[PDB]
Design a protein around this ligand. Structure first.
Ligand SMILES: *[C@@H]1O[C@H](CO)[C@@H](O)[C@H](O)[C@H]1NC(C)=O
Ligand SMILES: *[C@@H]1O[C@H](CO)[C@@H](O)[C@H](O)[C@H]1NC(C)=O
Ligand SMILES: *[C@@H]1O[C@H](CO)[C@@H](O)[C@H](O)[C@H]1NC(C)=O
Ligand SMILES: *[C@@H]1O[C@H](CO)[C@@H](O)[C@H](O)[C@H]1NC(C)=O
Ligand SMILES: [Br-]
Ligand SMILES: [Br-]
Ligand SMILES: [Br-]
Ligand SMILES: [Br-]
Ligand SMILES: [Br-]
Ligand SMILES: [Br-]
Ligand SMILES: [Br-]
Ligand SMILES: [Br-]
Ligand SMILES: [Br-]
Ligand SMILES: [Br-]
Ligand SMILES: [Br-]
Ligand SMILES: [Br-]
Ligand SMILES: [Br-]
Ligand SMILES: [Br-]
Ligand SMILES: [Br-]
Ligand SMILES: [Br-]
Ligand SMILES: [Br-]
Ligand SMILES: [Br-]
Ligand SMILES: [Br-]
Ligand SMILES: [Br-]
Ligand SMILES: [Br-]
Ligand SMILES: [Br-]
Ligand SMILES: [Br-]
Ligand SMILES: [Br-]
Ligand SMILES: [Br-]
Ligand SMILES: [Br-]
Ligand SMILES: [Br-]
Ligand SMILES: [Br-]
Ligand SMILES: [Br-]
Ligand SMILES: [Br-]
Ligand SMILES: [Br-]
Ligand SMILES: [Br-]
Ligand SMILES: [Br-]
Ligand SMILES: [Br-]
Ligand SMILES: [Br-]
Ligand SMILES: [Br-]
Ligand SMILES: [Br-]
Ligand SMILES: [Br-]
Lengths: 229, 235, 229, 235
């Protein structure tokens, strides 16, 4: 009864809600976090980017809950002498949601505990070394579930995140095409009890806070779909 | 390079840009023009509604022009002892476009003259009686092409509008599922020379201005898809 | 619970069920009816072409009925001195369905009456002059509903046919891009009472039987989709 | 230029090519290997099932290579006092491909050696214990790459396999929705140099050959899409 779908290989401001350092470069890359004119990634960067149309995630009258999927290509690069930090995340957030905290909290949470009012589901790619990991975030930066991630700088990473409303299972996977490595994490998420009926979808990324802990957080392409019975 | 598509059988304020008298009823109907609590449509009404995400329909860098398609179900009803006016339209408009003049101008134009700066492509369902018609509007309310439309009050109408950027052909069709009647009109439109690179997509409708010329202009469901470098998949 | 979808801008034998004169040319056009080496369309030609996978149209256990849509581009050309005949049709037919009669019966019917066992729904583009028309065919070549069609030779025609299982309305439209003319016809069809649960979809075309009544019947591209709850 | 996609939550003989022990139960489950009427899976079973329409995955004229994606839910169950064997696989095979050897060879190969003429790309779920694994097979049962798979009997498994022809990267993943466990493996495959222009897509599965190594190999639902010149839309 409701469907939404979009796909961009080249980003443009016009149908995005850009928050903070998120820009679309002249080459149409969604640079979530800031890169200076020298071409260097800057510390303490936070960017979020959302599709301009909200998505219905469930309907209280029917009790129906949406399924959804998103894929994107990201490039996280780290200059020599630096380590990576902090990562990026794909997020579903309430309509009108504004960025939260930088660094390890990814513009998503304001603390390291459970927060039922966060109404946040996220899959984060945590470049901060608990080893580097992909985490499923349900109302918490403390992933209810993680998997080790062998992060490699400068290599495009392709992500797929799916949520099945019937099983309630959220699945996130990352692949490095050029390195042919891959990582996956899955856990159940009751969206109905976590998210509002309508959400915005997109990204959030942060760079490290301390020198030598920095990265680019570029989304090179993005696709999203959701279906609500 | 770019794809957008959405589909709603029940509307909601949340992902729409509603303009003027356009409302979403508690039944989830998109009522483009005003209906009073006594259930009657009111005169001098205009409403518009758009999907909230802008659609890219071309880029000058590559010279690619988008193809697109939309379908919707509408209900135009007329109170007893009234005639219908004025119609509704599906439109592609510059991002940020706002309602224009009432009545015969359909919220799309300010005059009856050709206007190159309108950057307007619209498919109009004209209920004002030149017989009642569906018209393709390019930068004018004087449709560049029309077909007769045997309008019938209170009957759900299913519309499909498609544009193929290769042929520059715009096609609009209306069917009354319960009367089994159908109408179609087509003409080339050079979107690239008419519309800006990005557009909003949605509807506009007006009621008549003099007593006994009025109608509901309800949209019951809506789908849209566009691709910038497949209608079957779409309907 | 069931979906099927395909789209080809260039045909290939490999995923088609070609019946009779239907060929795929070296340029990947689906030539439903025969064209000789001289480049002339031949009389008494019949071709049908179907997608190789059957499509479920309804389910007797649920009583659910599929919606479906198809679009295609066709080019019907007529040599000088000839008139056009007979047309082509998009069809839904029982799985394993074999061509019926040539000429005015379009490879679809064996008579000009109602036949409940035909289990055939068709939209025909009748080039035979009742003026030339698009017709909706439900178990009969005698369209339950027609609309005048100003046929023009050599001009690509773009067709869309949709069936909505909720209203039961079948709609067929034709447009000539280069001429910007268009035609449409709609009527209700109870598929459940007409078609088997599974069907094959595709085309049928015929050329005239008598000299000076001939045409090419080329499908240049084709898309189909169907959904069954 | 070409797109194909289908999706079934309930299977039916009608649009499938079923091979060997593969059946569709009255509940509409795709049972790739044999289950007796006492409900128990039997030894030395092999079954395959394919979508009936061939898929174009490249053309040499233009040098375009298809991208594709498939998802499916499977259930591998083991009787008490048995271990599992041998697994199931999703496969792309030449049009007309037929089942190969049983057991560890999964109906995909005849030997344990590399075979360039196999024109086989497969993602295998190996239940035979080298720990139980998911493996990418290119012209060999000796997976060019594997990952450990913590197989659990009787639990529905959701698989997703994708191929991107730009990167030549094949990715396969399995999740157990009720155990919340998940596994993934990826490697480049040059489809163009491995597979023919057209392929059939579907599944293969085998049970063990010695007593106490057996399993069900049920597919409960399946989706496939391919494009020859969008995973999100697909799942
Ligand atoms: C985005 O679209 C606008 C047209 O509205 C264009 O001028 C601009 O170049 C585009 N940006 C990118 C990064 O392509
Ligand atoms: C629209 O969604 C909101 C939740 O944001 C809900 O409260 C409201 O009932 C919906 N409107 C309709 C007409 O269903
Ligand atoms: C169809 O596909 C085959 C490859 O199996 C190819 O050899 C042939 O040229 C193709 N036909 C057309 C008309 O493109
Ligand atoms: C498959 O479809 C046929 C109709 O062709 C039907 O009789 C049968 O019940 C279906 N099979 C299943 C398992 O639902
Ligand atoms: Br931009
Ligand atoms: Br929505
Ligand atoms: Br860098
Ligand atoms: Br590093
Ligand atoms: Br921090
Ligand atoms: Br971990
Ligand atoms: Br809400
Ligand atoms: Br840090
Ligand atoms: Br993407
Ligand atoms: Br609302
Ligand atoms: Br406004
Ligand atoms: Br207003
Ligand atoms: Br009236
Ligand atoms: Br304006
Ligand atoms: Br004027
Ligand atoms: Br007229
Ligand atoms: Br613009
Ligand atoms: Br008036
Ligand atoms: Br609609
Ligand atoms: Br061929
Ligand atoms: Br089907
Ligand atoms: Br000719
Ligand atoms: Br002629
Ligand atoms: Br005849
Ligand atoms: Br007629
Ligand atoms: Br049947
Ligand atoms: Br004749
Ligand atoms: Br087409
Ligand atoms: Br069956
Ligand atoms: Br076989
Ligand atoms: Br057999
Ligand atoms: Br076991
Ligand atoms: Br073989
Ligand atoms: Br061997
Ligand atoms: Br391993
Ligand atoms: Br081939
Ligand atoms: Br064994
Ligand atoms: Br599936």
């Amino acid at each position: 009864a409701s469907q939404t779908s979009f796909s961009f290989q080249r980003f443009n401001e016009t149908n995005l809600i850009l928050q903070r350092d998120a820009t679309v470069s002249s080459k149409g890359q969604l640079r979530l976090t800031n890169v200076n004119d020298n071409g260097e990634p800057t510390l303490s960067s936070l960017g979020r980017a959302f599709y301009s149309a909200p998505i219905q995630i469930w309907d209280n009258t029917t009790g129906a809950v949406a399924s959804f999927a998103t894929s994107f290509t990201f490039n996280i690069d780290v200059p020599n002498n630096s380590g990576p930090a902090d990562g990026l995340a794909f997020v579903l957030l309430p309509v009108g949601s504004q960025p939260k905290d930088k660094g390890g909290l990814l513009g998503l949470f304001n603390n390291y505990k459970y927060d039922s009012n966060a109404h946040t589901v996220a899959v984060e790619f945590d470049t901060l070394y608990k080893p580097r990991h992909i985490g499923i975030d349900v109302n918490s930066i403390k992933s209810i579930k993680t998997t080790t991630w062998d992060f490699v700088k400068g290599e495009n990473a392709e992500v797929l995140i799916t949520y099945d409303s019937s099983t309630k299972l959220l699945v996130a996977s990352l692949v490095y095409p050029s390195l042919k490595t891959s990582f996956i994490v899955s856990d159940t998420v009751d969206l109905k009890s976590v998210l509002p009926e309508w959400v915005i979808v997109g990204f959030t990324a942060t760079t490290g806070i301390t020198k030598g802990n920095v990265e680019t957080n570029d989304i090179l392409s993005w696709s999203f779909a959701s279906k609500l019975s």
